[model samples]
Target: SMKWMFKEDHSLEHRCVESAKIRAKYPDRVPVIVEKVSGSQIVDIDKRKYLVPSDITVAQFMWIIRKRIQLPSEKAIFLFVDKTVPQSSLTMGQLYEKEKDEDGFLYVAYSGENTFGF
Candidate 1:
């Protein structure tokens, strides 16, 4: 096991945007946002340049959820490392459990509890 790191963001919009990036496959199902991040980035999906904004503030996000529920440090750690996209802020959109053989190793599924099983 490796000791990974994660950073915090101060922007509220950043978190909101981070949440929007990820979603549940079923629309009728409860929608969970992993952790929408906001920052300017150039993307070339099909040789087309698309500058997008993204970021995530685990600390801030936790604060928002703090009033809603009790948080464990492990969830924060997992989201920032195992489940999140490696980027500047260190915060991530979601943390789906990792299975040996699965469609998505992690695709923002732990919204109900941010993440479980530190």
Candidate 2:
């Protein structure tokens, strides 16, 4: 149903190519630095460096973290920008242009939950 909306012009392929050109024309790929700030988990992703595709959404970034940490399907993970704001569809490239830090890092904090803390 929604596949039609995800065609050539709006697909990642076109976005990737456009972003590649933009990357050459301007420095826009800031590091997507993620930290597990809630606690020291087993995977240990504090200040982890990842070559994130700047042309993607916050949702995509969340999935990347999921795969990297080998999160179970039953588990849930939450990511916040600077551990204060929530994002759903904003592109990393857009965020980098608007809100990256002085050192060129988009800092994000995450917490994973599989069970409730009593």
Candidate 3:
């Protein structure tokens, strides 16, 4: 019975407490939640949650997700944070510090489109 975080009534509180505990345990990692937008052409990631190294660049993280979903070269993937694309050159820690939600977890959504134009 896992509902999308936005739709669940206590999601903010739950995420707040969860991220606090996670941060307390693993201070070097950023708590992240990733989701595929409905009707998106991209394949859904099997797991929604990630504990990512803060030092990793956004480009590196995107590559990780690409491999996790086994996306092919003909498709382009885009990651959104706070409804806008983040700079790939920025480190996860940098982005998290600026964009993490009030609940403490960094929320990201991914969507892609095929590159081959028919």
Candidate 4:
């Protein structure tokens, strides 16, 4: 089973180094860690770590995630950063600059609307 990033030993240090390396190699991209909120009925994403273009809008990113999870149109997926939903118009870079964790990677949690009993 995949463990939450916070649960992994030395995760902070590891993520810091990883994000640094990624930034050095791909300056135009932002390192992001996407995870499903616990107890959410949404399907697990095949990949958790992503190198997303900084220019992509949050709405665009969500669309990509929706496709990755193959969610049905009837269901809605909410993406949260720092426990708050980000504005769809914000670019990934803007969001990263504002909300990136101390470890240097942006962490995003996703859940279905029904996860909270509608």
Candidate closest to the true structure, highest lDDT = 4
Clashing pairs in 2: none
- Compare the candidates by TM-score and give the number of the best one: 4
Q: Is candidate 2 or candidate 3 better by TM-score?
A: 3
In model 2, which range of ten residues has the least summed lDDT?
1-10
TM-score of each: 0.23, 0.61, 0.86, 0.88
Candidate 1 has a TM-score of 0.23
- Residue-pair clashes, model 4: 0
Candidate 2 lDDT (Cα, whole model)? 0.59
| Candidate numbers sorted by lDDT from highest down | 4, 3, 2, 1
> Which regions in candidate 2 have their CA more than 4 angstroms from the true location?
1-28, 40-42, 113-118
Candidate order (TM-score): 4, 3, 2, 1
Error of 2 at 60 (Å): 0.6
User: Local distance difference test, per candidate?
Assistant: 0.29, 0.59, 0.82, 0.85
Tens-place lDDT per residue, model 2, 1-118, is: 0112213234556645654554566564646556664443636453365556668887888888888888876877776564354466888877667665444445666676422221
| Model 4 agreement with the true structure over 27-96: per-residue lDDT tens digits | 9999988988777788989888889999999999999999999998888999878667889999999999
- Candidate 2 vs. true structure, TM-score: 0.61
